[PDB]
Design a binder for these strands. Structure first.
Ligand SMILES: [Mg+2]
Ligand SMILES: [Mg+2]
Ligand SMILES: [Mg+2]
Ligand SMILES: [Mg+2]
Ligand SMILES: [Mg+2]
Ligand SMILES: [Mg+2]
Ligand SMILES: [Mg+2]
Ligand SMILES: [Mg+2]
Ligand SMILES: [Mg+2]
Ligand SMILES: [Mg+2]
Ligand SMILES: [Mg+2]
Ligand SMILES: [Mg+2]
Ligand SMILES: [Mg+2]
Ligand SMILES: [Mg+2]
Ligand SMILES: [Mg+2]
Ligand SMILES: [Mg+2]
Ligand SMILES: [Mg+2]
Ligand SMILES: [Mg+2]
Ligand SMILES: [Mg+2]
Ligand SMILES: [Mg+2]
Ligand SMILES: [Mg+2]
Ligand SMILES: [Mg+2]
Ligand SMILES: [Mg+2]
Ligand SMILES: [Mg+2]
Ligand SMILES: [Mg+2]
Ligand SMILES: [Mg+2]
Ligand SMILES: [Mg+2]
Ligand SMILES: [Mg+2]
Ligand SMILES: [Mg+2]
Ligand SMILES: [Mg+2]
Ligand SMILES: [Mg+2]
Ligand SMILES: [Mg+2]
Ligand SMILES: [Mg+2]
Ligand SMILES: [Mg+2]
Ligand SMILES: [Mg+2]
Ligand SMILES: [Mg+2]
Ligand SMILES: [Mg+2]
Ligand SMILES: [Mg+2]
Ligand SMILES: [Mg+2]
Ligand SMILES: [Mg+2]
Ligand SMILES: [Mg+2]
Lengths: 100, 124, 114, 146, 54
RNA sequence: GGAGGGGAGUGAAAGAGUACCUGAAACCGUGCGCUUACAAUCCGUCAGAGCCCUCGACGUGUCGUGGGGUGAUGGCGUGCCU
RNA sequence: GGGGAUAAGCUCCGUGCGUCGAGAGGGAAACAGCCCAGAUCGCCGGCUAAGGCCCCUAAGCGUGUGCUAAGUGGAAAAGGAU
RNA sequence: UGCAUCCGGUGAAGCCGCCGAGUGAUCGAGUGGUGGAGGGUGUGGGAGUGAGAAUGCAGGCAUGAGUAGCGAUUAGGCAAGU
């Protein structure tokens, strides 16, 4: 039992009870969220057509909000005296899928 | 008020050295030449932070082509049929499935083939 | 963990690499073989190293009171010390500066039961 | 996190391919594809996923056109004027296996992982091989019609 | 000529890596009631009892 | 033989012993974990197995929004200032 | 366009020319100046331009209709040839 | 430098690590080990105020390397002694 959740312009294969790292989305930690679907699998049978994809539902609850790890940026052009630096830290949300 | 230039310089010396930690030979020892490769290695970081997406998409496409051929169809046809059926799954999930559930991959390829029109050479 | 006694000779008048050459022959051997190899190794660096090992064995026997026959060199190494510095004339009047090296000798001998 | 193949988890298999009346280029291309493992859906460049492929009766390989007397395999020993000149006819007459071996070494990734993959290929001249204890599976190259 | 650069630490030590001393096996001789240590270079003289060993 | 050194004592401290507060970096070692003897090169970055150790749910090792060290192998890769 | 010999990666002009200079990305192997196209940052998402789709290397060893035997393709003329 | 005045032998500055945080130069009434006597929140004020380059200056240490050389054309061996 694994499904594909289309969120943050991405899709992920996730199984019930799993936890995933998805982009930040406005929701208080500990609440619940529902999402359209792109594919659901249960043993043999497979549901793929976009109609069933949009007709089934995936329910999960947001665990916490995470700022990722520091990632440095260093632009530079040799011999031309251009020296540019900047840090960045993206914010992420973690989901623990509940049921399908 | 003359200011003696000790602590400030040592701070950045150490910061650059630490950031360079783990490089080859004297290149993790000499600040005057660690800077060279701190700056380089981070330039490579900048460039490949996008090169990686291209490379990974390449790998996914290759895996998908392999799976389609093992299922008796060419990757381009798989994509065409999938689109014509109007599926919204992308090649990352395609590849992960193809290596995880061959049965689901088979079902998906049947869907694509069925959605594939009768004649492929039709000018329309 | 075994009782370790240490004994070193500092500012001793020889090059670090030339002491290390001799020292590499003895690392990890028992004191008997250490003494034998040192005495029958014709290297001027040997004499200082043999002196130091004899001193270390005496130190262990006296201060700690351990049987010499049970002793094996735990660790041994030579570190460059302060260097006397001299000037030595050379042709065409230009003067070149001599670096009279000097290295320390450290030898710590431990006990390893048979 | 996508999938990458483990060290020993990767699986091999053995195939035997006769070369009688086969086009050299097409045979080489198919052999290289199978060798690298692109057919498998476990392909990952850092670690080979190929299969030991054994080629039999390599002396009957055929080439198109008048190449049989106008193909020019080259090499240089290493000293000035040490250039060595040979043709397909001479190569087949004196050492046949080298033809296919060179053809596929050209195709394989010229890095050292490719130099390694090169190992798992073996080519013989006659229709027999001492590798009968590995139950190779006959593998006739075919195309997906389209 | 001269060098073009510094040879790496590793390169120098590698070149050094085969220049070292060696230890032989000693020999004892039972003469005059005592056993002393002499390389077999000396064994016969050791037995006879004239070799100047302290 | 002395130099030198190890104990004992002084002292709050002798990793304050007169070469004496603090003792850094180049530099040279010992030991430990890992890598390396089919490998062509601004020496890294992106992937990345394995091994080592670390931590929590869970038994003898498997999972887990795992870490640090190493990095087998492959994609890209022509230092810096003038 | 002038000069040079319609030679130079030549020189001298005009371009409400373009680009580099002062521009990263992809393509032409490599290559600022040629082709496509403007890098606020991140994403292990999708669609495309130039150029490509047998393998190295991602993509049709595709569809149908013809030409070529020269490895022409993958350096060149006056002329010559059932 | 000015300040409400505080921080500290229950460990300041300095040194070496670790953690977390800011887009940056950084920061942490944030700490682990050495050190054993001074620092200083905030808001202003003034600057000998920020180093990789200048064949820079002074000091220390590198490598060529345990390599070249050990400074003549007269030259030693041995006994015994210290
Ligand atoms: Mg500038
Ligand atoms: Mg590394
Ligand atoms: Mg001697
Ligand atoms: Mg006391
Ligand atoms: Mg000193
Ligand atoms: Mg002091
Ligand atoms: Mg190693
Ligand atoms: Mg090897
Ligand atoms: Mg190469
Ligand atoms: Mg390189
Ligand atoms: Mg590269
Ligand atoms: Mg390269
Ligand atoms: Mg013109
Ligand atoms: Mg000019
Ligand atoms: Mg521009
Ligand atoms: Mg450009
Ligand atoms: Mg390019
Ligand atoms: Mg932009
Ligand atoms: Mg390549
Ligand atoms: Mg391909
Ligand atoms: Mg086509
Ligand atoms: Mg076809
Ligand atoms: Mg036709
Ligand atoms: Mg041509
Ligand atoms: Mg012609
Ligand atoms: Mg004519
Ligand atoms: Mg105190
Ligand atoms: Mg303290
Ligand atoms: Mg403290
Ligand atoms: Mg103190
Ligand atoms: Mg202060
Ligand atoms: Mg103020
Ligand atoms: Mg201020
Ligand atoms: Mg100044
Ligand atoms: Mg400086
Ligand atoms: Mg500068
Ligand atoms: Mg300078
Ligand atoms: Mg030198
Ligand atoms: Mg010589
Ligand atoms: Mg000489
Ligand atoms: Mg002389």
């Amino acid at each position: 039992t694994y499904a594909i959740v289309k969120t943050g312009g991405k899709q992920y294969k996730v199984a019930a009870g799993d936890v995933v790292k998805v982009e930040k989305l406005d929701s208080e930690p500990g609440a619940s969220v529902s999402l359209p679907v792109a594919l659901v699998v249960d043993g043999a049978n497979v549901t793929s057509k976009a109609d069933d994809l949009a007709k089934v539902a995936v329910t999960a609850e947001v665990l916490e909000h995470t700022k990722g790890p520091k990632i440095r940026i260093h632009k530079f052009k040799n011999k031309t005296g251009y020296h540019k630096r900047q840090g960045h830290r993206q914010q992420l949300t973690v989901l623990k899928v509940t049921g399908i | 008020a003359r200011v003696k230039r000790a602590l400030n310089a040592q701070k950045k010396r150490r910061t650059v050295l630490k950031a360079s930690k783990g490089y080859r030979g004297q290149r993790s020892r000499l600040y005057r030449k660690a800077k060279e490769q701190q700056l380089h290695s981070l330039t490579y970081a900048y460039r490949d932070r996008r090169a990686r997406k291209g490379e990974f998409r390449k790998l996914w496409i290759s895996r998908i082509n392999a799976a389609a051929r093992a299922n008796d169809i060419t990757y381009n046809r798989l994509i065409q049929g999938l689109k014509a059926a109007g599926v919204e799954v992308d090649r990352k999930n395609l590849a992960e499935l193809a290596v995880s559930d061959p049965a689901a991959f088979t079902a998906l390829v049947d869907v694509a083939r069925a959605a594939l029109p009768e004649d492929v050479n039709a000018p329309s | 963990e075994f009782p370790s006694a240490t004994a070193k000779a500092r500012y001793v008048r020889v090059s670090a690499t030339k002491a290390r050459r001799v020292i590499d022959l003895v690392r990890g051997k028992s004191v008997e073989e250490a003494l034998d190899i040192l005495r029958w190794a014709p290297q001027a660096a040997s004499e200082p190293v043999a002196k130091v090992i004899a001193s270390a064995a005496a130190n262990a026997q006296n201060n700690e009171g351990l049987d010499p026959s049970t002793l094996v060199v735990a660790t041994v190494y030579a570190d460059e010390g302060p260097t006397a510095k001299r000037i030595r004339p050379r042709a065409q009047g230009r003067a070149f500066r001599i670096r009279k090296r000097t290295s320390h000798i450290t030898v710590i001998v431990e006990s390893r039961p048979p | 996190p996508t999938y990458t193949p483990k060290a020993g988890d990767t699986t091999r298999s053995w195939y035997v391919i006769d070369a009688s009346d086969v086009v050299l280029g097409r045979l080489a291309s198919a052999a290289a594809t199978l060798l690298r493992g692109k057919h498998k859906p476990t392909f990952t460049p850092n670690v080979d996923g190929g299969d030991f492929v054994i080629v039999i009766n390599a002396d009957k390989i055929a080439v198109s056109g008048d190449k049989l007397t106008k193909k020019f395999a080259y090499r240089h020993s290493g000293y000035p004027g040490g250039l060595r000149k040979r043709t397909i006819g001479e190569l087949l007459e004196k050492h046949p296996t080298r033809v296919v071996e060179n053809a596929i070494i050209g195709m394989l990734p010229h890095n050292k992982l490719g130099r390694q993959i090169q190992k798992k290929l073996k080519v013989y001249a006659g229709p027999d091989h001492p590798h009968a204890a590995q139950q190779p599976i006959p593998f006739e190259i075919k195309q997906v019609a389209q | 000529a001269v060098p073009k650069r510094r040879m790496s630490r590793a390169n120098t030590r590698s070149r050094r890596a085969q220049w070292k001393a060696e230890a032989p096996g000693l020999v004892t001789v039972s003469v005059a009631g005592q056993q002393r240590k002499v390389p077999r270079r000396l064994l016969k003289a050791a037995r006879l009892g004239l070799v100047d060993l302290d």
